[PDB]
Design a protein around this ligand. Sequence first.
Ligand SMILES: Nc1nc2c(ncn2[C@@H]2O[C@H](COP(=O)(O)OP(=O)(O)OP(=O)(O)O)[C@@H](O)[C@H]2O)c(=O)[nH]1
Ligand SMILES: [Mg+2]
Lengths: 432, 48
Amino acid sequence: MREVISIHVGQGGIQVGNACWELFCLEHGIQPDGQMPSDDAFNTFFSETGAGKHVPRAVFLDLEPTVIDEVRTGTYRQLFHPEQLISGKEDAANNFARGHYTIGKEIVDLCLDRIRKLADNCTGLQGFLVFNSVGGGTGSGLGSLLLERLSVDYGKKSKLGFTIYPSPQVSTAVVEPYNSILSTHSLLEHTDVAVMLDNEAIYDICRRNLDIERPTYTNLNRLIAQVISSLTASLRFDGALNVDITEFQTNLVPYPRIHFMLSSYAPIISAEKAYHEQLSVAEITNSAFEPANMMAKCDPRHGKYMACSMMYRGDVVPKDVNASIATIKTKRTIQFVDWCPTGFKVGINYQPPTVVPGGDLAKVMRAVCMISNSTAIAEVFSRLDHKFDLMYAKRAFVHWYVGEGMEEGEFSEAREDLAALEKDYEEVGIET
Amino acid sequence: ADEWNAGKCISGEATLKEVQTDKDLGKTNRFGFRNITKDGDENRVFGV
Ligand SMILES: Nc1nc2c(ncn2[C@@H]2O[C@H](COP(=O)(O)OP(=O)(O)OP(=O)(O)O)[C@@H](O)[C@H]2O)c(=O)[nH]1
Ligand SMILES: [Mg+2]
């Protein structure tokens, strides 16, 4: 009786999610066509069609026809509903103004109606899931505009956004710093939780444990897709200690302003190697806080920690979970902030992670996904802050932006908000 | 008082061995770092 609506937007947004469904689909056995081969735990992410196959709870919006139209001819041509794939005509072309003030408006009106129709079927709406990469054109605009509109129509429902940010040094576009600062401003005062999934960091995980010397975008997503499944694990399966989607933004956010965090997943072991490691819970948790294993290219050792939410999925006996947690406090390389003595909220699940055939993941019987808010986040904001200073120093590239309907001073106000955010974290970290 | 390669050298031959994409994607060819399981147990508990 609890449902979640998933929203995908942006070339990456459509691409980032696509790794989610094939993993989710294979967990409950639903074939690609939707017919169930052979209890009702699947209602959390799917809706009955009254007879026959099912219907996922998602909507695809992307202004560029090509990426969205890719799914219209694949093997999944029999799964997604036809008329919920709203498609534009002209792409945002990496211009932050085009996707939010010039072309985005003419299609958002469709977006609200579709989302409204989907919810009407449900009755236990827990929250929303939105995927939107700040590193892409349409994601920045459509992502921001949708966020404001969604809040007004519905209000207090929980929202979680799996934004993907540019890496500290490796980048694809040349205007990524702008849309990041502009997009970040909008997302700060409207979202309840935002995560760090910088692409480069996930590269390191691939090259260390898996040891894949030639990884591409297809491979990156699955690991991301895994994180999505783990977080919702205690939502649609029986568990001794459950955590509610409402009970995530209840124990993680300490203050109204700070609503960001970065996650990590482990253990990630391949089949040829899993023959040598028992994968004991006493050890697996150890890799959780290992600075290398952080999904984001950031240094957890440059500051203090606020809170850590770790959901345990597998066969762990409850006793061990408590046993390993205390040892964590002993370590002198990880120090907690002064104003939080007790800071571990541990969730335990029963259903093990499922292995997508042909993937890198090897079936492992104890898995953990950690979401913790740490003071180290300000580093990424600071570094990105430096980028914006250099380019605007002589207002390079500004011409393309005011040419679509955005005011010149809009960039003036964008920096001030982030400046406040950068200052805010330093204020928190000071001990009493 | 000029071979066949008079502008069309941009394309030719390209056996089915060269057409195959690179070497290995999302896959470690290393003997001990691969992902294929042994024939003894094609699927089973990989831990303790
Ligand atoms: N991890 C990952 N990120 C991707 C992938 N494809 C695109 N991205 C992200 O998308 C950002 C650039 O935007 P794109 O996804 O190419 O396209 P877009 O966001 O829809 O913007 P437009 O191209 O104008 O439509 C990059 O910075 C990437 O971080 C992918 O396959 N994997
Ligand atoms: Mg795109």
